Amino acid sequence: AECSVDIQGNDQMQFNTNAITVDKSCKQFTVNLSHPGNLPKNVMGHNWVLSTAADMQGVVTDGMASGLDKDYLKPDDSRVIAHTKLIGSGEKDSVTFDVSKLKEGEQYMFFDTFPGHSALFKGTLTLK
Ligand SMILES: [Cu+2]
Ligand SMILES: [Cu+2]
């Protein structure tokens, strides 16, 4: 099966997908984030951050607290299963992670931890 997905978010908080399926036969999985648009990362940055559903709230909240110079992620956050950098317009970042970190049956969410962006850019990731 395929083991990659392309994800983009613009200056308008508009993104291409709210649901990612990771096939169970993938050993690694890659997310390629891009940002169409004209605003820089300090004004309208986006990241892609993966945790269980239950951990999403805390990761988001602690991330906002940590600020731009930490890419809005609390340092050393063991709840983050994988994540891209925070990017701004015209930029691109890709993360490849080990699919052995995911357990069929558990509920995962992906999301942007830039302040407030969690409300509009988030989604489910499922291992099938
Ligand atoms: Cu395959
Ligand atoms: Cu964003």
UniProtKB/Swiss-Prot annotation:
Gene3D superfamilies: Cupredoxins - blue copper proteins. The keyword Metal-binding applies. GO terms for molecular function: copper ion binding; electron transfer activity; identical protein binding; transition metal ion binding; zinc ion binding. Disulfide bonds join C3-C26. Cu cation binds at H46, D112, H117, F121. Keywords: Copper, Disulfide bond, Electron transport, Metal-binding, Periplasm, Signal, Transport. SUPFAM superfamilies: Cupredoxins. One of its GO terms (cellular component) is periplasmic space. InterPro entries: Azurin, BlueCu_1, BlueCu_1_BS, Cu-binding_ET, Cupredoxin. Pfam families: Copper-bind. It is found in: Periplasm. The keyword Cell membrane does not apply. Residues 1-128 form the Plastocyanin-like domain. Transfers electrons from cytochrome c551 to cytochrome oxidase. This is Azurin. It comes from Pseudomonas aeruginosa (strain ATCC 15692 / DSM 22644 / CIP 104116 / JCM 14847 / LMG 12228 / 1C / PRS 101 / PAO1).
